[PDB]
């Protein structure tokens, strides 16, 4: 396997973030996966 990508990226909007949490909540406010 190959390595590279360090940061985290959304699975829907495909947007990169600073940390995991910052991305998690983003999906709850932007994507709101708490339906
Ligand atoms: Zn997103």
Q: Ligand 1 center to residue 2 CA distance, Å?
A: 25
Q: Ligand 1 center to residue 16 CA distance, Å?
A: 9
User: Collapsing DSSP states into helix, strand and coil, what is residue 16?
Assistant: strand
**What is the number of alpha carbons within 13 Å of residue 30 lying toward its C-beta?**
12
Contacts of 7 by beta carbon, 8 Å cutoff, 6+ apart: 16, 17, 18
* Radius of gyration in angstroms for the set of CA atoms belonging to the chain, rounded to a whole number: 11
Q: Ligand 1 center to residue 27 CA distance, Å?
A: 5
Give me the residue label for tokens 């190959």: 2
């Amino acid at each position: 396997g190959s390595s590279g990508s360090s940061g985290y990226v959304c699975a829907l909007c495909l947007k990169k973030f600073v940390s995991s949490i910052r991305l998690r909540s983003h999906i709850r406010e932007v994507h709101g996966a708490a339906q």
